[PDB]
């Protein structure tokens, strides 16, 4: 594709274009993921 | 300087005065949970 768009040359990005007029199951969701590690270690982080 | 059980231990002492005479104990200063392997220093 020599670095130009065309047939079978699609940019692997797509936009969202969020608007307040969409349906309930369409607005973006802010997501976080917390991962722990249950092993034998100095155990730096501990709860209250 | 000591390194045991995944902890680095540093004891320290200061005095204003070849090594002198007398007795003076060293008080604990810092403990650190680093957990590395130590073989040489500089």
Swiss-Prot record, chain A:
Disulfide cysteine pairs (residue numbers): 1-9
Q: What does this protein do?
A: Attaches the virion to the cell membrane by interacting with host receptor, initiating the infection. The major receptor is host ACE2. When S2/S2' has been cleaved, binding to the receptor triggers direct fusion at the cell membrane. When S2/S2' has not been cleaved, binding to the receptor results in internalization of the virus by endocytosis using host TFRC and GRM2 and leading to fusion of the virion membrane with the host endosomal membrane. Alternatively, may use NRP1/NRP2 and integrin as entry receptors.
Q: How does it assemble?
A: Binds to host ACE2. RBD also interacts with the N-linked glycan on 'Asn-90' of ACE2. Cleavage of S generates a polybasic C-terminal sequence on S1 that binds to host Neuropilin-1 (NRP1) and Neuropilin-2 (NRP2) receptors. Interacts with host integrin alpha-5/beta-1 (ITGA5:ITGB1) and with ACE2 in complex with integrin alpha-5/beta-1 (ITGA5:ITGB1). May interact via cytoplasmic c-terminus with M protein. May interact (via N-terminus) with host bilirubin and biliverdin, thereby preventing antibody binding to the SARS-CoV-2 spike NTD via an allosteric mechanism.
How the protein is affected by changing residue 4 to A?
Increased resistance to neutralizing antibodies
| Record note on what altering residue 40 to P does | Increased resistance to human covalescent sera neutralization
Consequence when changing residue 11 to L: Increased resistance to neutralizing antibodies and human covalescent sera neutralization
| Gene for this chain | S
Q: Which organism is it from?
A: Severe acute respiratory syndrome coronavirus 2
Task: Cite the effect that the entry attributes to residue 7 to V.
Answer: In strain: Omicron/BA.4, Omicron/BA.5, Omicron/BQ.1.1
What protein does this entry describe?
A: Spike protein S1
The shown residues of the full protein are: 480 to 527 of 1273
